[PDB]
Amino acid sequence: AFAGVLNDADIAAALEACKAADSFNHKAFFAKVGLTSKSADDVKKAFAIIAQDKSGFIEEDELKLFLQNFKADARALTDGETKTFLKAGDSDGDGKIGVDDWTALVKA
Amino acid sequence: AFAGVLNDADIAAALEACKAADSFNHKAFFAKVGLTSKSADDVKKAFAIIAQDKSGFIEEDELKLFLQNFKADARALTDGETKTFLKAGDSDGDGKIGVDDWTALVKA
Ligand SMILES: [Mg+2]
Ligand SMILES: [Mg+2]
Structure with a gap:
């Protein structure tokens, strides 16, 4: 769904790098996919x-499927990766990730 | 210290991928650097x-400096990355990483 929003080579590359289960790191992905360098508005x-x-x-259950927003049939995050991801992103501690959580996490 | 054991292209790309603090993932690094596909003996x-x-x-303190085995002046791991690393790796529970711990973790 990021057709036209992010670079296709970037998306491909960010996915390639975490293709193996338990190899995901959100800070690595955000940088490689090209989100970290975008403005807070984008x-x-x-x-x-x-x-x-x-x-x-x-x-949480949707966060598990994070990768599939960039490529439909990308793998699911494992429960470990999801737990690590949620815990880092959920600043306001409602057990999920809203727009404020998100914007802080990407720019972190 | 891996000059001649791993590809220089591989070593540089593995480090490139985790150049940002808190972006390190050992499963990611081990595959990119080319350790995961080598024989247990290797x-x-x-x-x-x-x-x-x-x-x-x-x-622990040595694991903190894990990246500097591949490139002398690579960045130190944060305490968070290091704690994650040691926990994943230390199967025999002695609080450090021996050859059996290492071999199993690399091949995971
Ligand atoms: Mg939240
Ligand atoms: Mg041990």
Whole structure:
């Protein structure tokens, strides 16, 4: 779903790098996919694409499927990767990731 | 210290991928650097080079500096990366990483 929003080579490359289960790192992915260098405004648009809503939240079970926003049939994150990802991103501690959580995490 | 054991292209790309603090992932690094696909025997050699010896162990403070085995002036791992690394790796529970710990973790 990031067709036109991020570089296709970047998306491919970010996915390639975490293809093996338990090899994902969100800080690595954000940089490689090209999100970290975007402005907070474009980071917000990226959130919207993923949560399907600027006011939405990414829940744990949806966070598990993070990669599949960039390539439909990418692997699922393992439960370990999801837990690590959620815990780093969920600053406001509601057990999920909203737009504020997200924007801070990408720019971190 | 791996000049001639691993490809220089591989070593540079593995380090490139985790150049940002807190972006390191050992499964990612081990595959990119080319350790995961080598024979256990070749994996044990890599351990003696790092640990200086087949009977040695990689302890916490040494693991912190894991990247500098591949490139002398590579960055130090943060305490978070290091704690994650040691926990994943230390199967025999002694709080450090020996050759059996290493071999199993590399081949995981
Ligand atoms: Mg939250
Ligand atoms: Mg041990």
